[PDB]
Amino acid sequence: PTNFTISVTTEVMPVSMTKTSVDCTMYICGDSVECSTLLLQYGSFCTQ
Amino acid sequence: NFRVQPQDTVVRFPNITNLCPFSEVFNATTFASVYAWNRKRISNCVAD
Ligand SMILES: *[C@@H]1O[C@H](CO)[C@@H](O[C@@H]2O[C@H](CO)[C@@H](O)[C@H](O)[C@H]2NC(C)=O)[C@H](O)[C@H]1NC(C)=O
Numbered sequence: 001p002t003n004f005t006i007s008v009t010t011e012v013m014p015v016s017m018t019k020t021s022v023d024c025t026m027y028i029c030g031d032s033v034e035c036s037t038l039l040l041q042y043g044s045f046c047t048q
Numbered sequence: 049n050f051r052v053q054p055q056d057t058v059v060r061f062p063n064i065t066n067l068c069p070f071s072e073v074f075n076a077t078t079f080a081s082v083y084a085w086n087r088k089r090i091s092n093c094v095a096d
């Protein structure tokens with residue numbers, strides 16, 4: 001080569017995504033106390 | 049998540065002033081044959 005080109009190029013890399021949290025009783029049962037009572041057998045799964 | 053407990057109770061039914069014809073359909077003098085069974089429309093009444 002007898003010449004050169006100074007090249008600037010971009011590289012887009014994801015780093016983080018959206019941090020999310022889930023309230024199980026509001027999703028599964030909403031505001032009903034009967035479903036909230038029945039959901040007490042599934043608390044370990046929601047903690048997981 | 050932040051829960052708000054209900055305090056009052058709201059009941060909203062359409063305003064009906066008539067009882068349902070229980071005596072007309074249960075204490076009728078004659079009943080239809082099963083092959084020619086009678087159908088009666090029931091509307092605008094309170095099913096006590
Ligand atoms: C169904 O209809 C019959 C016939 O109308 C009613 O029997 C009458 O009942 C009254 C009130 O007890 C008596 O005074 C009469 O003697 C009965 N017989 C007749 C021929 O009128 C019966 O009570 C009715 N049942 C209902 C729930 O309304």
Ligand SMILES: *[C@@H]1O[C@H](CO)[C@@H](O)[C@H](O)[C@H]1NC(C)=O
Nearest residue numbers: 001002003004005006007008
């Ligand atoms: C190299 O290229 C540049 C343009 O990119 C030009 O101005 C320069 O004269 C060249 N150099 C050489 C041919 O030696």
